[PDB]
Design an enzyme around this catalytic site. Structure first.
Site, PDB file in Angstrom:
ATOM      1  N   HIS A 180     -53.050 -34.663 -14.872  1.00  0.00           N
ATOM      2  CA  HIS A 180     -54.083 -33.589 -15.099  1.00  0.00           C
ATOM      3  C   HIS A 180     -54.337 -33.253 -16.661  1.00  0.00           C
ATOM      4  CE1 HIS A 180     -51.317 -30.452 -16.430  1.00  0.00           C
ATOM      5  NE2 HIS A 180     -50.839 -30.473 -15.241  1.00  0.00           N
ATOM      6  N   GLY A 233     -49.228 -24.344 -21.728  1.00  0.00           N
ATOM      7  CA  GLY A 233     -48.755 -25.552 -22.696  1.00  0.00           C
ATOM      8  C   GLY A 233     -47.748 -26.148 -22.308  1.00  0.00           C
ATOM      9  N   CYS A 278     -46.760 -27.846 -19.792  1.00  0.00           N
ATOM     10  CA  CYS A 278     -46.872 -29.080 -18.791  1.00  0.00           C
ATOM     11  C   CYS A 278     -46.386 -30.248 -19.616  1.00  0.00           C
ATOM     12  CB  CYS A 278     -48.199 -29.139 -18.176  1.00  0.00           C
ATOM     13  SG  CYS A 278     -48.853 -27.879 -17.341  1.00  0.00           S
TER      14      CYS A 278
HETATM   15  C1  LIG Z   1     -51.187 -20.239 -13.566  1.00  0.00           C
HETATM   16  N1  LIG Z   1     -51.658 -21.311 -12.375  1.00  0.00           N
HETATM   17  C2  LIG Z   1     -51.197 -22.802 -12.426  1.00  0.00           C
HETATM   18  O1  LIG Z   1     -50.436 -23.025 -12.900  1.00  0.00           O
HETATM   19  C3  LIG Z   1     -51.985 -23.617 -11.211  1.00  0.00           C
HETATM   20  C4  LIG Z   1     -51.693 -23.321 -10.014  1.00  0.00           C
HETATM   21  C5  LIG Z   1     -52.310 -24.128  -9.019  1.00  0.00           C
HETATM   22 BR1  LIG Z   1     -51.967 -23.886  -7.290  1.00  0.00          BR
HETATM   23  C6  LIG Z   1     -52.958 -25.374  -9.280  1.00  0.00           C
HETATM   24  C7  LIG Z   1     -53.050 -25.681 -10.650  1.00  0.00           C
HETATM   25  N2  LIG Z   1     -54.225 -26.666 -10.965  1.00  0.00           N
HETATM   26  O2  LIG Z   1     -54.069 -27.699 -10.243  1.00  0.00           O
HETATM   27  O3  LIG Z   1     -55.036 -26.568 -12.053  1.00  0.00           O
HETATM   28  C8  LIG Z   1     -52.702 -24.716 -11.768  1.00  0.00           C
HETATM   29  N3  LIG Z   1     -52.923 -24.902 -12.833  1.00  0.00           N
HETATM   30  C9  LIG Z   1     -53.806 -24.185 -13.843  1.00  0.00           C
HETATM   31  C10 LIG Z   1     -53.501 -24.772 -15.522  1.00  0.00           C
HETATM   32  C11 LIG Z   1     -52.625 -25.689 -15.341  1.00  0.00           C
HETATM   33  C12 LIG Z   1     -51.370 -25.054 -15.588  1.00  0.00           C
HETATM   34  N4  LIG Z   1     -51.101 -25.339 -17.054  1.00  0.00           N
HETATM   35  C13 LIG Z   1     -50.032 -24.717 -17.839  1.00  0.00           C
HETATM   36  O4  LIG Z   1     -50.005 -24.865 -19.169  1.00  0.00           O
HETATM   37  C14 LIG Z   1     -48.935 -23.765 -17.281  1.00  0.00           C
HETATM   38  C15 LIG Z   1     -47.770 -24.308 -16.976  1.00  0.00           C
HETATM   39  N5  LIG Z   1     -47.000 -23.478 -16.221  1.00  0.00           N
HETATM   40  C16 LIG Z   1     -46.904 -22.052 -16.306  1.00  0.00           C
HETATM   41  C17 LIG Z   1     -48.040 -21.579 -16.483  1.00  0.00           C
HETATM   42  C18 LIG Z   1     -48.398 -20.280 -16.557  1.00  0.00           C
HETATM   43  C19 LIG Z   1     -49.657 -19.655 -16.615  1.00  0.00           C
HETATM   44  O5  LIG Z   1     -49.873 -18.212 -16.640  1.00  0.00           O
HETATM   45  C20 LIG Z   1     -50.626 -20.304 -17.279  1.00  0.00           C
HETATM   46  C21 LIG Z   1     -50.680 -21.709 -17.471  1.00  0.00           C
HETATM   47  C22 LIG Z   1     -49.350 -22.456 -17.222  1.00  0.00           C
HETATM   48  C23 LIG Z   1     -52.253 -26.034 -17.696  1.00  0.00           C
HETATM   49  C24 LIG Z   1     -52.808 -26.898 -16.377  1.00  0.00           C
HETATM   50  C25 LIG Z   1     -53.949 -27.313 -16.770  1.00  0.00           C
HETATM   51  C26 LIG Z   1     -54.405 -28.325 -16.106  1.00  0.00           C
HETATM   52  C27 LIG Z   1     -55.962 -28.753 -16.442  1.00  0.00           C
HETATM   53  C28 LIG Z   1     -56.484 -28.433 -17.218  1.00  0.00           C
HETATM   54  C29 LIG Z   1     -56.089 -27.403 -17.950  1.00  0.00           C
HETATM   55  C30 LIG Z   1     -55.000 -26.475 -17.701  1.00  0.00           C
HETATM   56  C31 LIG Z   1     -52.433 -26.349 -13.775  1.00  0.00           C
END
Ligand SMILES: CNC(=O)c1cc(Br)cc([N+](=O)[O-])c1N1CC[C@@]2(CN(C(=O)c3cncc4cc(O)ccc34)C[C@@H]2c2ccccc2)C1
Ligand SMILES: CNC(=O)c1cc(Br)cc([N+](=O)[O-])c1N1CC[C@@]2(CN(C(=O)c3cncc4cc(O)ccc34)C[C@@H]2c2ccccc2)C1
EC number: 3.4.19.12
Lengths: 306, 306
Positions: free
Chosen positions: B41, B143, B145
């Site tokens: 992603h 951030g 990931c």
């Molecule tokens: C909170 N929500 C989900 O994490 C979530 C849940 C589902 Br169900 C589906 C997706 N989904 O498929 O997009 C999700 N992402 C939203 C953004 C995600 C997550 N991220 C992080 O850095 C992150 C990692 N850990 C905990 C975190 C807690 C947070 O409060 C905020 C961010 C994070 C970056 C990534 C992204 C992908 C593509 C473009 C931009 C950003 C993926």
């Protein structure tokens, strides 16, 4: 989201761990520049520890009485000195892996990461706090002496703890990296025991703020309290007094959550008086006191180190 | 003595963490030999994640669309491929710090250490278990990931987890290092939630054995139980069934303490039925299920890694 007992990345410390052998005694040492630091009881036998005179014991040793092994390479010792309860062995090789570092003596209530080691080889890493009674509740077996506790700030490793011994209650005692014991303990086999301990109040409060930042609010209330009336409940439950400096330290977390410090004290007062009633906070059924205000900010805001 | 949630030394993994930027998206990647692994992603915008076609999104990208930064040095990408939910960027430089490593897909109930990272820079290390519902209760912010979970055996790092996302309950979801999600989750912003979870029974038992090894015996009793009658109480308290293979796994700990596995099951049965009555085990007021039998042996016996 989430809140965990989070240790610092241990790589910069792993590269400093060596093995120190004197006689039949083997323990861990810390190799920074051309000096290895280890507990001075490396020169002792078990019978020595009953009542040791370290100046006398050490006078009888030579540089060649100390074997220093850093992985495969043996390091030749070219000098030795005693500083309080640590031995400093000068070696012929500067450690190529020496990080930017400092030696720090922490206050009770501060936390650090421990890299537990055996035979100069790191076994694991975990967070500890220095208890008010100047012990730590670590995880240490025979052979772990000379394992060190540390914090990392930006690039710089601040070493604050070197492990010496385990007290009869199973808590651990040691020194700063200049060899000065935390607490009243000495490196001798005598009757010495951990004194009465207390709960680190400012740390419990910080952890309650972490829970709020992570979406737990069930323990909050509308009540408030005065510092004086709080500390009276604190005394009754064996919590440390909360100082105004403690209040000021909790400033940034109070501002981030919109909960006044004294308002969080009223919450904690109720938790102490009522219990948790089978509920949990951040996955704990106890009030957690091993996170500082700095630890909460670091983990709820993603600080890094390089 | 002591028992702590102990992570592996993270040095061998720290040397593999890099930063991967595609467009305005930046996350972490894992650099082993001449390949960087990161969540696919990275190629997505927020609007893409609502309903992404990764083959279509990736076809529109070039090697020069990916910036890879390893500390100060930028790494030139010379190829890219998608394997399930991970992107593999081939680079012009083999990582000089590559450890001996394997990729492993763990079973639910196994533990690993997480090195949490931001912008290719390690922030902290902590232990996690893979829950029965294939989530982990980590500590992860925007951030993080591409942060990875791992075990170390002797010299060899076994990577088992790469972080992708946080579910609405605040638990975390991700993949093995081949890009296959643990659990039913997908890398899309949809309604998906953690299913019902359960308590890892064999792990609670292991932890009760750790407590005995560390001198806590207050919860033991003279009763015994049959496997069948235990599992009936387990079902009632949302514990996983104990298999005979689970019993066999607890063999070494049962032999070290002289407590038959089924005798420890009778102890646990009573703890589940009566509660702890304001007492604690290894510093916990809860029954702890995030230590495997291997984790107990490793820490109560001082295994090391080099
Ligand atoms: C909170 N929500 C989900 O994490 C979530 C849940 C589902 Br169900 C589906 C997706 N989904 O498929 O997009 C999700 N992402 C939203 C953004 C995600 C997550 N991220 C992080 O850095 C992150 C990692 N850990 C905990 C975190 C807690 C947070 O409060 C905020 C961010 C994070 C970056 C990534 C992204 C992908 C593509 C473009 C931009 C950003 C993926
Ligand atoms: C358990 N008892 C004390 O630790 C103890 C308590 C007091 Br009060 C005074 C001394 N004292 O001054 O000798 C003590 N040591 C006994 C041996 C010690 C401790 N040690 C370890 O490797 C060790 C480290 N951590 C936790 C451990 C838990 C254990 O069950 C067994 C060992 C350790 C080696 C060192 C030593 C020194 C000189 C010659 C040989 C060995 C020092």
């Amino acid at each position: 989201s989430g809140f965990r007992k989070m240790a610092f990345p241990s790589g910069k410390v792993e590269g400093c761990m060596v093995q120190v052998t004197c006689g039949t005694t083997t323990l861990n040492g810390l190799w920074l520049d051309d000096v290895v630091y280890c507990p001075r009881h490396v020169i002792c036998t078990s019978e020595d520890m009953l009542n040791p005179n370290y100046e006398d014991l050490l006078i009888r040793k030579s540089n060649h009485n100390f074997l220093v092994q850093a992985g495969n390479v043996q390091l030749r010792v070219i000098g030795h000195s005693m500083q309080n309860c640590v031995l400093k062995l000068k070696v012929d090789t500067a450690n190529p892996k020496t990080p930017k570092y400092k030696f720090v003596r922490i206050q009770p209530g501060q936390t650090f990461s421990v890299l537990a080691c055996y035979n100069g080889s790191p076994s694991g890493v975990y967070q500890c706090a220095m208890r008010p009674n100047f012990t730590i509740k670590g995880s240490f077996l025979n052979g772990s002496c000379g394992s060190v506790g540390f914090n990392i700030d930006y690039d710089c490793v601040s070493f604050c703890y070197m492990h010496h011994m385990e007290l009869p209650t199973g808590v651990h005692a040691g020194t700063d990296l200049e060899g000065n014991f935390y607490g009243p303990f000495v490196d001798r086999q005598t009757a010495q025991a951990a004194g009465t301990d207390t709960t680190i109040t400012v740390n419990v409060l910080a952890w309650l703020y972490a829970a709020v930042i992570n979406g737990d609010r069930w323990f909050l209330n509308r009540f408030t309290t005065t510092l004086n009336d709080f500390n009276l409940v604190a005394m009754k439950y064996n919590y440390e007094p909360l100082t105004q400096d403690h209040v000021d330290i909790l400033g940034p977390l109070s501002a981030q959550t919109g909960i006044a410090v004294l308002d969080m004290c009223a919450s904690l007062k109720e938790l102490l008086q009522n219990g948790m009633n089978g509920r949990t906070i951040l996955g704990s059924a106890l009030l957690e006191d091993e996170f500082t205000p700095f630890d909460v900010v670091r983990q709820c805001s993603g600080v890094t180190f390089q």
